[PDB]
Amino acid sequence: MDGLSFVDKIPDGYKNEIDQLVKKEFANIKADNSVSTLTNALYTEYLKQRNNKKRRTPDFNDDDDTLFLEEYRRKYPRIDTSRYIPNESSEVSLLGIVDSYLKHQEIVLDTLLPQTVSNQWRINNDYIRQTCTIVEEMNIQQRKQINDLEIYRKRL
Amino acid sequence: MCSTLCHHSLPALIEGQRKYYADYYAYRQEIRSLEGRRKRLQAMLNSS
Amino acid sequence: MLCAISGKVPRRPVLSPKSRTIFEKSLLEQYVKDTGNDPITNEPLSIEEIVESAQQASLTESIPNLLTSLQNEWDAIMLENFKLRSTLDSLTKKLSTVMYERDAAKLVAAQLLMEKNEDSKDLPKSSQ
Amino acid sequence: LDSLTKKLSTVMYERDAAKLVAAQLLMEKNEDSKDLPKSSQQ
């Protein structure tokens, strides 16, 4: 488990080396209704279902069919012209009121970006001290190790 | 990354004691060889 | 400011008293009837336990609401969840490659733990 | 999706962390060989 990240100042060759040894040990081991059916089929096939491309074109001196199609264009154009009246009445006040809401929504996210930033650096900060604590202790151990190694020889 | 460094802290902190304790016992054995090798040298003066 | 189920910006937000989290009324009311518990914390919660303005500027070119806008909404719902199902499938596959490579490393360490200390032990024995 | 990503992230981090154990271990094992070999020779 133990591998000191901050203390071990470990080349790319060692990653490539260790990857090969890990690789060799891997060589050894080796709820909705009908809605979901049509939605998954639409996405898989990459084709959206065609809508009513009729109101836009039409034609004068048609028949009973275009008499309907004509009368459709009138009522929707009157609804359109009424739908543009209540927008222009308020105008830009309704738009800029929503623009202000979006600024309150945005700043909230970036506050959380900082809260995460601080606690993430704070955890790493605690790790750092641990790394330097033990890395010294390991240094102490190795020095003592080398002392015996030659001490035992010089006695013999 | 927060949850990473959170996890990395918990698994590392336990691995260190095990790292050290191994080397600690490794050191104890090394001391014994040191502790005996002297005595044989010390007994060279007894024969003299 | 958002709902904690759909990812909406709620028109009638309602907060639960067991876990402080704001949901849109329709979506929290649906969950309680499906299974009577709080979706996040899995704690007992009922419809009576719940405790109850946003402006969108309708575009200048607002026919399109029936044809173009509604079409895009069910395209965007369709191709996202399909792509999201694709993302979930790969995470489980990449999970299996993670755990296998992890366990492969465990065996290396275990194999090397026997190797190292015995090599060190042999140096201690050599002196004798 | 995100709950599996936590497992993915914790693993990949811990994998390459555990990978560095080997790199260290291998070089120490190697050091033990030449040391003993050069000593046992003489």
What percentage of amino acids of chain A are in beta strands?
A: under 5%
Whole-Å distance between the termini of chain C? 76 Å
- Annotated CATH homologous superfamily of the domain at 1-54 in chain C: Zinc/RING finger domain, C3HC4 (zinc finger)
Strand tally of chain A? 0
Structural class of the helices, strands and pairings of chain A? mainly alpha
CATH fold description of the domain at 1-54 in chain C:
Herpes Virus-1
Query: How many helical elements of chain C?
Result: 2
Summary, kept brief:
This is part of a larger assembly, with 1 copy of chain A (156 residues), 1 copy of chain B (48 residues) and 2 copies of chain C. Chain A has 156 residues and is an all-alpha fold. Chain A has 5 helices and no strands.
How does this model look, in words?
Chain A has 156 residues and is an all-alpha fold. Chain A has one domain. Chain A contains five helices and no strands. Chain A is elongated and about 120 Å long. Chain A starts with 11 loop residues before the first helix and ends with a helix. By secondary structure, chain B is mostly helical. Chain B is 94% helix and 0% strand. Chain B has helices at 2-42, 44-47. Chain C is mainly alpha-helical and 128 residues long. Chain C has a domain at 1-54: Zinc/RING finger domain, C3HC4 (zinc finger) (Herpes Virus-1, 2-Layer Sandwich). Chain C is built from two helices and two strands; from the N terminus they run E-E-H-H. Chain C has helices at residues 25-34, 68-126; strands at 13-15, 22-24. Chain C has a two-stranded antiparallel sheet. The longest helix of chain C is centred in the C-terminal third of the chain and has 59 residues, at 68-126. Chain C is elongated, with a radius of gyration of 28 Å. Chain C starts with 12 loop residues before the first strand and ends with a helix. The chains are: A mainly alpha (156), B mainly alpha (48), C mainly alpha (128). Chains in contact: A-B, A-C, A-D, B-C, B-D, C-D. The PDB classes it as rna binding protein/rna. The entry lists the keywords Catalytic Step II spliceosome, C* spliceosome, RNA BINDING PROTEIN-RNA complex. Cryo-EM structure of the Catalytic Step II spliceosome (C* complex) at 4.0 angstrom resolution. Chain A is Pre-mRNA-splicing factor SNT309. Organism of A: Saccharomyces cerevisiae (strain ATCC 204508 / S288c).
